[model samples]
Target: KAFDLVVIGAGSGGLEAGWNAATLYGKRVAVVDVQTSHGPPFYAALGGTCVNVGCVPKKLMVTGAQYMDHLRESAGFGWEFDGSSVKANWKKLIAAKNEAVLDINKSYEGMFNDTEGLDFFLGWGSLESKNVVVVRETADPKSAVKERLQADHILLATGSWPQMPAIPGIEHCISSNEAFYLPEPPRRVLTVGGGFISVEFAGIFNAYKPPGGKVTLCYRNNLILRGFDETIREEVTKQLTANGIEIMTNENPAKVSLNTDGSKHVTFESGKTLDVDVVMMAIGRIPRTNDLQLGNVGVKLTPKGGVQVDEFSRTNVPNIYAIGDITDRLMLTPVAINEGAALVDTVFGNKPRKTDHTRVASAVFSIPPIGTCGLIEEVAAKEFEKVAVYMSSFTPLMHNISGSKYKKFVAKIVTNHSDGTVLGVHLLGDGAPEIIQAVGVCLRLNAKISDFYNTIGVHPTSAEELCSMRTPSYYYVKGEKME
Candidate 1:
């Protein structure tokens, strides 16, 4: 029995292609992913990072943290629940979050078992030949027979894993992968890196302060988020810091040492030292391509160590293709899913279409949270001749009513002044992601500035602020902002 397509890794991209190829295209398909490293029950679950760890657990923790905030802020809303006695039980919260992960894990497995043309494999899937995949136990000499599967097309959809910085005692530091299963929340945490993972982890720990812990984010860069807008970068920094997250910018980590008392010592190159209960290395993530043995089958990879693929998700080898983070693309779940769908249409349906990589919308679930679409102000200035900017940065009505004193909600729209073409929509505060997403429609067709004004906005709503945003706060001819 030969498979029409064999997809490695049951990640977002892999599942998209696997399911579509089997049900929609009516082709026999086998999806192989490492579930565990042994003979019996060796393979891991069917779901990848987003379902198991990345967003699922991360957001669950974020929501758990937010619940603490709601309880704390309840008095402000006249919902008094005796704040002095309230406390968050970290152990119970982690268990509940793990259950949420288990529910998703079971659903993916069910999908495979229920589907007629789809088969799921659990093992270390590697490219043995142009059209052959060898699935072995993560560790060899297993009781079960190694599976040799043949396919007309081999798709590499393996995603990525969190990267730990090289240093002694780094072994003691945990990654985002281990964060969810951590027995209990750390009393004090040192989250390394300036990325969204680091910022969000720090935000979660800080917001869950009823169990009262401290979080210090250490990043070599001055800004918290490296590839985001300057305003957002700075705004998140201000909000997190105000929320009691220690933002240690320009602090390059040198080493991590364990103390006799079981506390961790983080020494920085700047001659700064921090003692914390846990050190979370959220520096970055690396594509999960190494173990695939791509070179054995002559599949090319980029300088970034990601599998090289063309716009059609095709590899150098005619019979193989790679998608998702392995291509080092946007690395978001939706991007990977869209790519998988497009690839299936191209291969099975003979339809020629590539997922629109541009104009993608994304969000970071930090303390204040951030939802953004299109280019950042810095990139917009470089791409267009002139950029028109409309913004609103003021105390939100609720905050003013509740006597909240942190940096207020911020919303900014970047457009080309020449023809009034909207370039970007950015928001930093509550419901930022949902608000920014509605603007995705305009971006798809490159809607104009006048379009925002033509539609009436709801009064007394946070989202309404964007429709009536009239005056350009600053103009950018080149990268520099000018009045």
Candidate 2:
């Protein structure tokens, strides 16, 4: 039997595509996923990497760390604790996260099963022909196949996996996928990378003071979160530094030596050495296209192993499509979902909508969460003729009495002076994600800067700072002489 659409990999993008194709267009869809008897060994359960290992687990850890912030600021709120200690039980948190992930995964599975025109296949899907997908029954070393599938269109959404560099002694380091399910919390964790995962894990391990523990982040670059706004990045680095997370910037790991006690001794190019219980390489992730026989067909792939696709998610082979991290477009959960939905609409729903990736909002769930939307100051300066920047960086009122020198907030809004249209919004502090998301909707609808100012402030909240910045703290005009 031939399917209207065959989706490979039951990941975020694939599931979204299946949902849209089956429900919206009433097309017969089949989704194939690797059937491991033991399930995901590292991050058990489903919902792909985002729900299991990447976003959800990271956010849960962030929320847990934020409780410490609450405790730190409790004194300022006229509340006192009698030195009562709060400890994080890693096993408990991991178990809870696993439970939550499994429930959601099962829900998705059930949803597909209950859907009218959807079928689920458990196996590794490979392209036997341009229009046929061969489903292998086993993912073991034997590589046995039990079935095959045919489809009018096939979508490849296999997602990505951790990429280990070819550096010497790299085997001593662990990736983010394995770091989440560490058997025991490391006393000292040395995370290497300048990306979101590196920064986030470093913050998480640093904030998680399990009696006696420490974290050191080593980056080869001068600054972390390189693509983010300069001011926001600086502020976040300051906060991380203040929180006792040692950041070794412009330093690359020369070598790693395993100590007698199984600890890792990492030597940097800067002649610095750190002995840590664990070394996590949050360098990056590569598209999971190694096993997929893309080369057998005419499907094009990028140099980085990502499947090449057009605006409509159609691959070089017209009948085959790709989405999510495999396409290497925008490696975000929401973006993958949108791409999947867009692909289904283009193929079967009779509503063709190209994926618009501009102004995508995202957050770095650091100790003090950072939320950002639209262009950075540098980008805004180039994109707009007149850019007005309104910024406010201060200690929140709730932290007045806590004596916590680390409690600070930064809010910035970049607007086009000609039209007063809000170009970007950025915040690095508490509730940054929540506030930015609410503002994102308005900005997407071409909301003006005056509208933000005229809007009523949410009293006694950190978000109020976004609307309350009246003065032009900073401005940049094109062709203007600089003093």
Candidate 3:
């Protein structure tokens, strides 16, 4: 019953921590989790949000949407295809996506079986004390006690859950967690939020079948993607609107009412109403620290209920540690894995290190998509005494040949004006994500804008714009703009 480590939540962070501790340090480890309902009828598979509901299935849906555009643009390439003849099969796509998720779940399980020093527990795990963890059957969290494991170190990686707004008849609505399991594509979708999740889902729903699907993105604020650079938000807004997504700003739903035909009627606080088949609330997600019984051990938590851990992921109680979404440090899957590795090394491998969080690359899989790293223009201007901004906007070669008139590619770089130190790189286009990944490396090395100017770009590539922009669009000094 005693182990070196017990990780509760076989998610990205937990599995990484547990597996590494056991395989590398020969520390005994046990990981616990079980399938849980995301929607009324569908259960979320293991491997956490990335593999099950968040990034994995979502990117697949985004790919599905991209194909719709590809089909439309094929006519320009001398391919004679009837647009109306092509149909969208929601069932087939969902089935394929689900199978892929199940495959990953099996892979995670297989890893545990193959590892010598690790064990898997199929139940819900909670901390009974700093040194003890109790498991209950997944179905019966109260009475069906499975077993207790005594461990020298305990990790809480339960992850986070989507948060829905409190509005009348909100029960008629769903979150991004449940959108993956819808039986079929909704005819009309009204996504509510300004976050990346909300915008990404709006893009996915726009391309769902029966061309020209009606999709509206309603946000409470004036701008979507509030934390991103101003240019990205503006460019994405233009592109989304041009692609037929109605962007509603400064509005929140007052209430949702059910209509007879199974559609929902939404009334905003502005006294405006809209009808849609689906209402997805992607406002945000909060840490899933409930039922963790942390209070019993006097483990501290943030105001939002996230486990509070120090730089080494150790709680106030030295034996208890936390990582991933539960820590609220960074919510990305890769960040969680990296944090888990750091914690394992610190605790077991005797290599005390902190995962660097700055200047990490990120991609948004919206219709056009986004790849960005480092500081935004506004933030860069404030951080640096004199910041130079380089930007270029044009139609990419593929879009030009495809006769897609509205799609414009935008690229930008924010750099320190005095030393030419690259501050940020932001791109909004088809291959922005892939291109920004390489730029992210440049940023981490403290490379200057001159370094980008020295490198030869691949011919006819949208990414080359980053290297070719020789002129600064503008410069900001002390938050004031100068040409």
TM-score of each: 0.96, 0.94, 0.96
Worst 10 residues of 2 by lDDT: 36-45
lDDT of each: 0.83, 0.80, 0.86
Stronger candidate by lDDT (1 vs 3): 3
Worst 10 residues of 3 by lDDT: 36-45
Q: For model 1, how big is the CA root-mean-square deviation?
A: 2.4
Question: Candidate 2: where are CA atoms >4 Å away?
Answer: 35-46, 78-85, 137-142, 479-483
lDDT of 3 by residue, 1-483 (tens): 999999988888988899899988999998887663232332444577787888888899899888878887888888887666888888888888888788788888788788888998877788888899898875444758787999999999888888987789889999987888888888889899988899999988888745556999999999888878788898899889988899999999999999998899999999999999999999888998886778768999999999998888998988899999998877888888998999999999789988777888899998899998888888888888999999999877778788776688989899999999998898898989899887878988998988997899989889888889787999999988898
Give the Å error, residue 329, model 1. Answer: 1.8
User: Which one is best on TM-score?
Assistant: 3
TM-score for candidate 3, please give it: 0.96
> What ranking of all candidate models by lDDT puts the best one first?
3, 1, 2
- Candidate 1: global Cα-lDDT? 0.83
> Which of 2 and 3 is the better model by lDDT?
3
Cα lDDT for residue 284, candidate 1? 80
Evaluate model 2: give its TM-score: 0.94
